Design a binder for this molecule. Structure first.
Ligand SMILES: Cc1cc(CSCc2nn(C)c(C)c2-c2cccc3c(CCCOc4cccc5ccccc45)c(C(=O)O)[nH]c23)nn1C
Length: 150
């Protein structure tokens, strides 16, 4: 429960600042101690993932053809299917969130800023609900910060 809210805040803040072209955001009270360092790490690693995988991200975004809220809702099916296929690791978790930021930037360009918070919830549901046991074993977001040790 606490992990869900903490994850939702980190993911929501990162998607929102990526879409508005911001490098920071105010804490919303649910991310706690680990929140600041997690978002700082996610900005570093996440920005890098979007840069290094830009052609693949542009290709997939185009194929997904996201124009509105109904299209955003439809993403959860493929999101859970792809994210559940294969190994669990921090690298894949960053790819999931980074693609979310890449989609959020797209949503802002097409005046669909209202879809960003629903998308963050979609991503948080997939991440936390399918990886809760693994996240607990890694000490969640403290594990994330330590793994990348930026
Ligand atoms: C959507 C999809 C993805 C694939 C993998 S091939 C594309 C591809 N090539 N490379 C080299 C990379 C890095 C990707 C790629 C592109 C986009 C996302 C991912 C993911 C995360 C899981 C799927 O996440 C989402 C699916 C849909 C909408 C989403 C909207 C917001 C946030 C996440 C979303 C991975 C991975 O787990 O390794 N890899 C990704 N197949 N499909 C159908």
């Amino acid at each position: 429960d606490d992990l869900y809210r903490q994850s939702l805040e980190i993911i929501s803040r990162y998607l929102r600042e990526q879409a508005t072209g911001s490098k920071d955001s105010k804490p919303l009270g649910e991310a706690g101690a680990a929140g600041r360092r997690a978002l700082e790490t996610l900005r570093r690693v996440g920005d890098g993932v979007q840069r290094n995988h830009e052609t693949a991200f542009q290709g997939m975004l185009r194929k997904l053809d996201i124009k509105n809220e109904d299209d955003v809702k439809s993403l959860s099916r493929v999101m859970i299917h792809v994210f559940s296929d294969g190994v669990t690791n921090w690298g894949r978790i960053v790819t999931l969130i980074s693609f979310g930021a890449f989609v959020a930037k797209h949503l802002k360009t097409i005046n669909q800023e209202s879809c960003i918070e629903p998308l963050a919830e979609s991503i948080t549901d997939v991440l936390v609900r399918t990886k809760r046991d693994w996240l607990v074993k890694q000490r969640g977001w403290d594990g994330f910060v330590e793994f990348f040790h930026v």
